Design a binder for this molecule. Sequence first.
Ligand SMILES: CC(C)(COP(=O)(O)OP(=O)(O)OC[C@H]1O[C@@H](n2cnc3c(N)ncnc32)[C@H](O)[C@@H]1OP(=O)(O)O)[C@@H](O)C(=O)NCCC(=O)NCCS
Ligand SMILES: CC(C)(COP(=O)(O)OP(=O)(O)OC[C@H]1O[C@@H](n2cnc3c(N)ncnc32)[C@H](O)[C@@H]1OP(=O)(O)O)[C@@H](O)C(=O)NCCC(=O)NCCS
Ligand SMILES: [Cl-]
Ligand SMILES: [Cl-]
Ligand SMILES: [Cl-]
Ligand SMILES: [Cl-]
Lengths: 504, 513
Amino acid sequence: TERIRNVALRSKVCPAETASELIKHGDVVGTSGFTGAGYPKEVPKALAQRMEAAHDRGEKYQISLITGASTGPQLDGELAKANGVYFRSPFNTDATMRNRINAGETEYFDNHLGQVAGRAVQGNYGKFNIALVEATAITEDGGIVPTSSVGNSQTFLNLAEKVIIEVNEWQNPMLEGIHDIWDGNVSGVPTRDIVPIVRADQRVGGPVLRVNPDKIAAIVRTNDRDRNAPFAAPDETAKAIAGYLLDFFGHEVKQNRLPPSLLPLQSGVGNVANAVLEGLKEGPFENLVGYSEVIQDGMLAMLDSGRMRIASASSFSLSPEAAEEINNRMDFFRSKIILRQQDVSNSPGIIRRLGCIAMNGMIEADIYGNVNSTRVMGSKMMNGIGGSGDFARSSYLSIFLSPSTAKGGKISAIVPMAAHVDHIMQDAQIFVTEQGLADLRGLSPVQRAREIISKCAHPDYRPMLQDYFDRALKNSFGKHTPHLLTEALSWHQRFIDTGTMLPS
Amino acid sequence: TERIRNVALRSKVCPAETASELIKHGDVVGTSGFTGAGYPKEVPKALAQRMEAAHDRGEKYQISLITGASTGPQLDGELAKANGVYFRSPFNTDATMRNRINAGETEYFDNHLGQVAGRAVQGNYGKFNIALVEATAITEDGGIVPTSSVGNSQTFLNLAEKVIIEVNEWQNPMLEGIHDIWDGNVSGVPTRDIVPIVRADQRVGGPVLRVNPDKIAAIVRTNDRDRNAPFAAPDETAKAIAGYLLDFFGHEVKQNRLPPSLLPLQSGVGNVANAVLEGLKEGPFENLVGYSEVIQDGMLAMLDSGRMRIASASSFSLSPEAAEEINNRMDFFRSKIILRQQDVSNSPGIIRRLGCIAMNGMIEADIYGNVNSTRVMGSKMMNGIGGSGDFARSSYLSIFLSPSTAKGGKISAIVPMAAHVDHIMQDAQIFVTEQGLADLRGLSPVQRAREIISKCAHPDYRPMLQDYFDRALKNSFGKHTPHLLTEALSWHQRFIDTGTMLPSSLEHHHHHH
Ligand SMILES: CC(C)(COP(=O)(O)OP(=O)(O)OC[C@H]1O[C@@H](n2cnc3c(N)ncnc32)[C@H](O)[C@@H]1OP(=O)(O)O)[C@@H](O)C(=O)NCCC(=O)NCCS
Ligand SMILES: CC(C)(COP(=O)(O)OP(=O)(O)OC[C@H]1O[C@@H](n2cnc3c(N)ncnc32)[C@H](O)[C@@H]1OP(=O)(O)O)[C@@H](O)C(=O)NCCC(=O)NCCS
Ligand SMILES: [Cl-]
Ligand SMILES: [Cl-]
Ligand SMILES: [Cl-]
Ligand SMILES: [Cl-]
């Protein structure tokens, strides 16, 4: 079945190489792509090849690359390999690009995901020269059907001087209809419109991205794959975490602090998320609803088993097994999933209104419950803040989940002071490790410390943490949030120096 | 005239002392009060006396005190002097209470102001035993007219088992009508209502707080003043800061990145805020709008001149002279001002929709532009985060303003690493000091550092900052946000040990060579 259904636009089909020539040194390029899904593939590869050649000839050739969130080898990977990105935002997970970022070779800023569209419209990244967006199809009326994510694509299409569409035959034609694109003012010039979403399952828009056809400078026919999540399963640590959390949800429901169906759920991806979602798949809470950034393996299973009724997100993050699954029953799943613009999925106004329960991972927390989501030792980027701030601060309950240690026990995930802060105390109420659960609601910082140390810290590190806290209480400048500044970051330095946070 | 216009409720009138006896050791008490305005006065004073008397006999007597925001000497002050508060939230500016907090004698958590009502309804502070609310009047149908602030009063009235009202004749009767109290679900059980505010001058509710009259256990007639802090006349440092900011606004307008009427403005109080408000009064702008937490002297000034068309807030923060001005013209100013519940003034949904410009103070920022609003040396509370997070994160533009140094030059307000973080890099776009303005939009952390160091840091500290940065760039574990963990917090420790962040020349320092 022909994917370009608007006859007139078929005259704009051209090779990826030729399309890449539209992109000039210095350009700001906005692309589709979120959680390894729906990013352009072939034009970035052709661009990277030409960048390498240009550099070899002594010609500067770099772009600014703005996305939905993470992409894949074909985009972040190839461009990073070619040393062709001078600035990157807002969220990366590619190893080559991560290395460029941590070497200072590519400038990076990890904006709150739900804010990126608004900052782009404000001009913070500069004028968008190019929008490069992957599509499942182009409708007879010229609508652009998104692929496996929506992300920021509608905004990039609005802003960009020239538009390049990659129509990817690898993507399932039955994706058409799954997206919900609102034509209102979410991230434009103030005063913005009210987004009339009052339930997580509410569609308020249409199935296509809109663009003036005169702005389309090239369409490239492509055939290449998204990334997939690991198939791998929850270990003992993840299952213990899930166990503590589910017990907690049970007690809240019993105390009438949550409905029997809980509240709209926001979850991450990873061992821990899968375990939590796996836990819920067979849990005592029925008619669950998801209002999240991403559809992962865990949520897909519940939409399947009816334990979750519907899930809202901006993107997919699926294992090959899960992808195969959904691609076989798209007609079914398509009625249980809504893919929204990321400035809507991650809108704090909507998240607070719906009363979302936020469940997110973390690098580390300190004893006062400040959370680092991003920067190892305070300086080395992992992925980025993503939407964890959008959700943590706006949620009805903000929960953070992590193994109590990292790197085979050589790092404590509970530390005297976080080496970098992404989420302040006020934005984190509940902590869960395989050691236990700390409920911090209504507590002062010293009271938070008692709970975090006693409930969440690993036995190998707990006495050291308690020792730090007790001596801090005695010798700190102030006693409201006791610290010993000579020692606060010393565990991190110990790891840098010796490879472990444990004393010799 | 009679302030209690509901006849039945007059039977509940009693002395302050008697009313205070309703409050028991251990009680959670929610009160009116925000930026030193509209807090109860006589009952707290009586309570403090009875607490001190109990303590002298070896009898425990303490409460949990939950407020709108800051109060005043009669409340935070008296209770703190009496050591009568075991837990306090969400925001304090009283010096005695500050001392109790920093000594560990009063447990404290500074919640985001716009979230307090919601967390109270969720039960985070426990069950509310008492709501103690100051009123201008009580209407014929039993409505409670608030005074110089709204704060969290409607929420506290809903939650509390027993209610005590202080009817304060010092407060101008013409305050009645200035408030907008919504019965909508802003901070209740999900799903919440859409709060349908689409302009700063929009009223969505009515003039009174609502309470079941059966919960009213006591009404006390009072006559006592709010805490009207002296006007902080701008110094040269403040004027310089304001000048840079106003130049920046002017440029944004000339580049069509803001309209000539700017956008709804949120500002603070004090020296720098006053300088900015004076600058706004004289600048090349028109038809300004306030959407903030507070109404300050400079705002009245622009409402009078017509430069500002309306000012929305939860409270007043006026000097005695300004308080006098508004009292003799309350008829006029009541038409230009809307006082809202703080969970509405500080609603992230509304702040973002309106596109507010946020302008806030700070203790310090690090070279990467993370901001500390609260904890000196990382451990000693000043005031609290207040609504700075509500506004900073939700705003169209988030701006932080501060002198480049503190403590007569012995502290740098720009440091290698902040000792505590309230506002992450993502929540701060513009920094201004008397040295200049750093525009950080679209920059990576290393690029942020270049701008902050060059534009904002004091000449006495810039070389030391550049040295830290340069050596971090060469040695840091990662180079995305370069740090030297061995010395990141060393300037703070230096201040603790020596009373200054400036290094001695009797030992080696990398920037000296
Ligand atoms: C924090 C985050 C990296 C954790 O991911 P996770 O899969 O749940 O946790 P894991 O235990 O598997 O650890 C992931 C990686 O971080 C590393 N890590 C985790 N904690 C660490 C620590 N305290 N010190 C050093 N490294 C750490 C792990 O080593 C691992 O890296 P590796 O494979 O190179 O060894 C991840 O949640 C994230 O990037 N958060 C930011 C975005 C976000 O939260 N968005 C909201 C929801 S869409
Ligand atoms: C950060 C804050 C304290 C600054 O106050 P300010 O009036 O703007 O500026 P000041 O220079 O007068 O500083 C106030 C006090 O903090 C101290 N201070 C400021 N910076 C300091 C620093 N870098 N190191 C140590 N102390 C510092 C000052 O010495 C002063 O102390 P003092 O009263 O004992 O003399 C204040 O803005 C605040 O409390 N912010 C949190 C609440 C908020 O922003 N709400 C938003 C809407 S208003
Ligand atoms: Cl909305
Ligand atoms: Cl709380
Ligand atoms: Cl709303
Ligand atoms: Cl930005």
